[PDB]
Structure formats: structure tokens, C-alpha cells
Design a binder for this molecule. Structure first.
Ligand SMILES: COc1ccc(S(=O)(=O)N2Cc3cc(C#N)ccc3N(Cc3cncn3C)C[C@H]2Cc2ccccc2)cc1
Ligand SMILES: CC(C)=CCC/C(C)=C/CC/C(C)=C/CC/C(C)=C/COP(=O)(O)OP(=O)(O)O
Ligand SMILES: [Ca+2]
Ligand SMILES: [Zn+2]
Lengths: 322, 298
């Protein structure tokens, strides 16, 4: 029963032009967040492109930044002088796919970098320092799917590791033994989509756990008795769409929550209404709305969190449950 | 006023970062970098590349220094980690840096680590990073399932930061042994108990649906019929109890209870309207299941 109460004066209208300007003009927090920069760039581009506004960003500049961030190993860093990581590898590859500029980086070395991060049990480390997370299972296969190179990894052992993070409640955690969390469920469902293993999800059970994320305010949390947050609009919805149970949440209440999270003055979305916005929450607010069928937003792949049309172009569209 | 002192901080972080990178290409893997990253990471634990740098220094110093000077650096490092975790107890790299560090110690104090997990779980009993690190520690220290299951039994009952703890139970239990009938009916007890204390605490209910999903037997059917009545007394507007009764009747004789299953679906929809679409599909699936069953009659 810990939930937000939505107030009278919370926005009830989609403010796309503000979100475009907020993103267009972002970094003019930015300094402490250079460590995620490649992914912030992905987040900004993806939300802008979903909103039709991708031209307002700097393609040529970005194509040069990415290239400068590919290390000799083939992994991509968050930023210049930073170390390569699977996260920013996925982000970069997504950006280049957004831009149809795959050739910009060495594809073969990306593939080899991602291939190098798989472990005996099928899991992936995010980098050479070995942190295991189901996030990285998703990042690995998502990256390779986009490069047509999924057969570079050990799929079977990959699947098995993921399925081993499946829990009593039907959900998934970080690692074997970890508590279900909408975030990791997105990664695992996304992963099983990519690998054609959705028949292994118990969809009614996980779909029920997922829809119970929705609180009286209409907002979604990540796991039982926690506070809601707009970014879960993405984690939960993307998961539900994937397993064909998107209609199990109350779409209008959720939509009212998501709009309530906008900052009417500065643009962007925040985790919850009246808080400081950021780009991440702004992407996931918009991507969540698109998952629910908002008309001014391009349809988004629930797997790749990129406009459907981009993926249509590259002909990578995992079959979903229903 | 406040802008001054925090442009001050950005200036210094911003110069320190610069000097760290400069030092890095040149290859100055020294104490001076440990000191510079200390400044930065203390204010920004998610700067992953800096945990990487630290690691590389400690490994580079680790040889060209005395096992006494190394040991000093490990102790210095553990306290920096804890100080960083008090800042950002959710930092993936801060926690994983502590994982790396402990994993490579020749004689690591796991009891102290488990106590640290205690402290962090006191602050945030749902902190999944800490539960993970706790399971990391329990496995490095070969803590046995029953010891952990006691820890869990002390963090649900005393207080209700429940779901993360009932999950851990969920995993620890099968490690003691389609889970044994004797254990199943014993958990039906602990859980049926749970929801006469807070019938609106959801962990017990989620857990109990697992227990049902996972022979009827006079023993079990009677415990289920009992559950079903216990549940009916409780119905004296609690959605979890209502769903459970449907699932119990389903568990018992779905053809016999078809009428009541339908009644319940109605009450449950009115109590939990947000789940209307789920409950409709669940009802459709049960109704179809039943039609299959009626075709068993000749
Ligand atoms: C300002 O404090 C922070 C805290 C953490 C991080 S982070 O570790 O790099 N990362 C990305 C992230 C980016 C932004 C933005 N701009 C904002 C938040 C945020 N979080 C924190 C968060 C979001 N919702 C609730 N919480 C607590 C998620 C985190 C992990 C993540 C990374 C990639 C993809 C999905 C998830 C960054 C900033
Ligand atoms: C292509 C895309 C969109 C992603 C790549 C895949 C990755 C890295 C996914 C990360 C998934 C994840 C773990 C999301 C959760 C983010 C979040 C809201 C974290 C905070 O969770 P808690 O620490 O439980 O805090 P709260 O309960 O306060 O929300
Ligand atoms: Ca442009
Ligand atoms: Zn969030």
C-alpha cells in the first residue's frame, strides 16, 4: 500500500515537443554521468527517433564518437578513454542500427568481444572483470541478433543459464537464486524471444506476477510492496508484450501514471510525479506509451527497445507468444 | 551559496579524472592514482572504469611491493568500499569490486562480510545487490541452507521486509531435499499462518500459489478444504484470499465447484478491477478446462 497519490495538477497530456527539446538540448549530472555516455546517447536517440525527431541530433558526430570508443578487443566503451563493456557495446550497435551505419565499427571484433564474455554455464560477464548478470545475457544476444551473428555464442548453454534464473513466482533475477525483478524479467524474456524459447516461460503465471506490479495510482513497481516508477512502464510492459499478456494491466490507469511523471516546464519524465526528470526515464515513459498504442509515438520493438521500423529494415523481429 | 561549493567539487573531480587518464596512458600505476580515483569514486561510485583502474593498480603494486604494503592496501581498500557503499548501496561496480577483492584474499573474513550484509539489510531489507552479495558470501563460506533459512526465519517474523526473504526461503528449502508432500503440507501451515497476521501481506499469497501449483489425499484434500473455509472466514474484500479460494476449488474438484468458481470470479473482479482482464482470461481458461473434463463423461 506504499504508493504515490496522483495530484489534480499532474500533467494529463502528452508533451512531445518539450521532450524533443529537452533531449535535443541535453548537456549544455551530465558531468558525473560520462561513464554511461554511450547508453545515454542511445537513450536520447531512441526516444527522439520514436518521436520522429532523430534528425535534430548529430549523426556524423555520433558516428565518430562510437568509432573512437571501439577498443582494439572489439568492445565499446561508454566514452573516450573509458573501458569497453557489454552495455555500451549493445548501445553502440543499437545506435549504428538506428543509423544504418554498422560498417562504422569492426563487426567481427564486436562479435568476438561478446563471444569472449560467455562463461562455462552459459552466462555472460559484462566485461573482463566478470560480473555475471542476466542483463548481460540479454545484451550479448541482443547485440549478436542485430549483427546476424547469434550463432557465435553457445545458445543452449545460454538458454539454460537464463532458465536457471527463473523463480517460484514465474519471474527472473540477476543470477541463479536472485529475487524476481521486472528489470531482469525484461532481460530474460527479451533473451528467450531472441533465442526462440518463449514456450519455456509460464506465461499466465509470470503475466500475473507482472500485472500485479500495477498499483492503485496506476503506476508500476518492479517487485512486490515497492514504490512505482515510470521506467517499469518499460520493464513490465515490454515483458508482457513479449509473452502476449500486455492487456493484463490496466492501460488507462498506467497511461495516467506515465503522463503524471512528465515535467511540464522542462520536459522529460521523472521516476515519479514532481521529481527531477532524466533521459532514461524519458525514454521509458515514451517507450511505455508506445507499447500501449500512443499515436504520436512510433511503435517500438518490446525486445530491442527501438522503433519497429528500424528492425523491419534489418529483418530481425523475434516471434513473440501472442 | 550551495552552487559555489558544488562547482568546487565538479572542478576537482573534473581535474582528478583528467589526471587519472593522463597517468593511465603513461602507465603510472601507483598510489597517486589510488588517491585520485579515491576522490572521484567516493563522490561517484558508478564510475566503473575507475574500479577497473584501482584493480589494475592494486595488481601492479601487488608485486612490486611488500606483502605488508599490499596488506595495508587491501585494508585501506575494504574501508573505502564500505564508505562507498554507505554513499551508494546500489552500485553494481562498488559491490562487484568488493566481490573481486574478497575473492582474491588468501584468508578472507566471511563472518564480517555476513555482518555487513546484516547492516545493509537493516538499512534496506529489499536491497537485491545486498541479497546477491549475501548469497555470494554464503557460497564462498559454504554456509549451509539451514543456517540461512534461520536468518530468513528471523527477518520475516520479527519484521515484515518479507518478499526478498520469502524468496530466499523458496530457494533454500528445496536445497534441504513436486516438493515433498510432508514439507508441502508443513509450508501450507506456515503460510496459512502468515495470512492470519497480515492477510494483506502478499509474499505468503504468492508463495502459497506456488505451493498449490507444486494423489490428493485425505491428508491434502482435507487441508485444502480446511484452507478453503479458513479463507471463507477471512473473506469477511481481500483479493488474494478470493483468488486463492478459486484456485483451491480448482485444486479440489473444478467440475463440482464450477458454479462457485463463477461466483468468486465476479466478487474478485469487483474487489480488484485492475486485474479484470487477467481474471477474465483465467476464468475462460478454467471454463474451457471444464468443458474438456465434461467430455470425459460417456
Ligand atoms: C542519478 O542516479 C543514478 C543511478 C544509477 C545510474 S545507472 O546505474 O547508470 N543506471 C541507469 C540510470 C540512468 C539514469 C539517467 N539518466 C537514471 C537512473 C538510472 N538508474 C537508477 C534508477 C532508475 N530508476 C530507478 N533507479 C534507482 C538505473 C541504472 C541501471 C540501468 C542501466 C542501464 C539500463 C537499465 C538500468 C545512473 C544515475
Ligand atoms: C535495450 C534496453 C532498454 C536495456 C538493456 C538491458 C539492461 C541493462 C537492463 C537493465 C534492467 C534492470 C535491472 C532494470 C531495473 C532498473 C531499476 C528501476 C532499478 C532499481 O531497482 P531497485 O534497486 O529494486 O530499486 P526500486 O525498487 O527502488 O525501483
Ligand atoms: Ca542533425
Ligand atoms: Zn526508474
Amino acid at each position: 500500500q506504499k504508493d504515490v497519490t496522483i495530484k489534480s495538477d499532474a500533467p494529463d497530456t502528452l508533451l512531445l515537443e518539450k521532450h524533443a527539446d529537452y533531449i535535443a538540448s541535453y548537456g549544455s549530472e551530465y558531468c558525473m554521468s560520462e561513464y554511461l555516455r554511450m547508453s545515454g546517447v542511445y537513450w536520447g536517440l531512441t526516444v527522439m527517433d520514436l518521436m520522429g525527431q532523430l534528425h535534430r541530433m548529430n549523426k556524423e558526430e555520433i558516428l565518430v564518437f562510437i568509432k573512437s570508443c571501439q577498443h582494439e578487443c572489439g568492445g565499446v566503451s561508454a566514452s573516450i578513454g573509458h573501458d569497453p563493456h557489454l552495455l555500451y557495446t549493445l548501445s553502440a550497435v543499437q545506435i549504428l542500427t538506428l543509423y544504418d551505419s554498422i560498417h562504422v565499427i569492426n563487426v567481427d571484433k564486436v562479435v568476438a568481444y561478446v563471444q569472449s564474455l560467455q562463461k562455462e554455464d552459459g552466462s555472460f560477464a559484462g566485461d573482463i572483470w566478470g560480473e555475471i548478470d542476466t542483463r548481460f545475457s540479454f545484451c550479448a544476444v541482443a547485440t549478436l541478433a542485430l549483427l546476424g551473428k547469434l550463432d557465435a555464442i553457445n545458445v543452449e548453454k545460454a538458454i539454460e543459464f537464463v532458465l536457471s534464473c527463473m523463480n517460484f513466482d514465474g519471474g527472473f533475477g540477476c543470477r541463479p537464486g536472485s529475487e524476481s525483478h521486472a528489470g531482469q524479467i525484461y532481460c530474460c524474456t527479451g533473451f528467450l524471444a531472441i533465442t526462440s524459447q518463449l514456450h519455456q516461460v509460464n506465461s499466465d503465471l509470470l503475466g500475473w506476477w507482472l500485472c500485479e506490479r500495477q498499483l492503485p495510482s496506476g503506476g508500476l513497481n518492479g517487485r512486490p510492496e515497492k514504490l512505482p516508477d515510470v521506467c517499469y512502464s518499460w520493464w513490465v510492459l515490454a515483458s508482457l508484450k513479449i509473452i502476449g499478456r500486455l492487456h493484463w494491466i490496466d492501460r488507462e490507469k498506467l497511461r495516467s501514471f506515465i503522463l503524471a511523471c512528465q515535467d511540464e516546464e522542462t520536459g522529460g519524465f521523472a521516476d515519479r510525479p514532481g521529481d527531477m526528470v532524466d533521459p532514461f526515464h524519458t525514454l521509458f515513459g515514451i517507450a511505455g506509451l508506445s507499447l500501449l498504442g500512443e499515436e504520436q509515438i512510433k511503435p517500438v520493438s518490446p525486445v530491442f527497445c527501438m522503433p519497429e521500423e528500424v528492425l523491419q529494415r534489418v529483418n530481425v523481429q523475434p516471434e513473440l507468444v501472442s | 551559496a550551495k552552487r559555489l561549493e558544488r562547482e568546487q567539487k565538479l572542478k576537482l573531480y573534473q581535474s582528478a579524472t583528467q589526471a587519472v587518464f593522463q597517468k593511465r596512458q603513461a602507465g603510472e600505476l601507483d598510489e597517486s592514482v589510488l588517491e585520485l580515483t579515491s576522490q572521484i569514486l567516493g563522490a561517484n561510485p558508478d564510475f566503473a572504469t575507475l574500479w577497473n583502474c584501482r584493480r589494475e593498480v592494486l595488481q601492479h603494486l601487488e608485486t612490486e611491493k611488500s606483502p605488508e604494503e599490499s596488506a595495508a592496501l587491501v585494508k585501506a581498500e575494504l574501508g573505502f568500499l564500505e564508505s562507498c557503499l554507505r554513499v551508494n548501496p546500489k552500485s553494481y561496480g562498488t559491490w562487484h569490486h568488493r566481490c573481486w577483492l574478497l575473492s582474491r584474499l588468501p584468508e578472507p573474513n566471511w563472518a564480517r562480510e555476513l555482518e555487513l550484509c546484516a547492516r545493509f539489510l537493516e538499512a534496506d531489507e529489499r536491497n537485491f545487490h545486498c541479497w546477491d552479495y549475501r548469497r555470494f558470501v554464503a557460497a564462498q563460506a559454504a554456509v549451509a541452507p539451514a543456517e540461512e533459512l534461520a536468518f530468513t526465519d528471523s527477518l520475516i517474523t520479527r519484521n515484515f521486509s518479507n518478499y526478498s526473504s520469502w524468496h530466499y526461503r523458496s530457494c533454500l528449502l528445496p536445497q534441504l531435499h513436486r516438493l515433498p508432500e510432508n514439507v508441502l503440507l508443513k509450508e501450507l501451515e506456515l503460510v496459512q499462518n502468515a495470512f492470519f497476521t497480515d492477510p494483506n501481506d502478499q509474499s505468503a499469497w504468492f508463495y502459497h500459489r506456488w505451493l498449490l501449483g507444486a494423489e490428493l489425499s485425505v491428508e491434502k484434500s482435507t487441508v485444502l478444504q480446511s484452507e478453503l473455509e479458513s479463507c471463507k472466514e477471512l473473506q469477511e474484500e481481500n483479493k488474494w484470499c478470493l483468488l486463492t479460494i478459486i484456485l483451491l476449488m480448482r485444486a479440489l474438484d473444478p467440475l463440482l465447484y464450477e458454479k462457485e468458481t463463477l461466483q468468486y470470479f465476479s466478487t474478485l473482479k469487483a474487489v480488484d478491477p485492475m486485474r479484470a482482464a487477467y481474471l477474465d482470461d483465467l476464468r475462460s481458461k478454467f471454463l474451457l478446462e471444464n468443458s474438456v473434463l465434461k467430455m470425459e463423461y460417456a
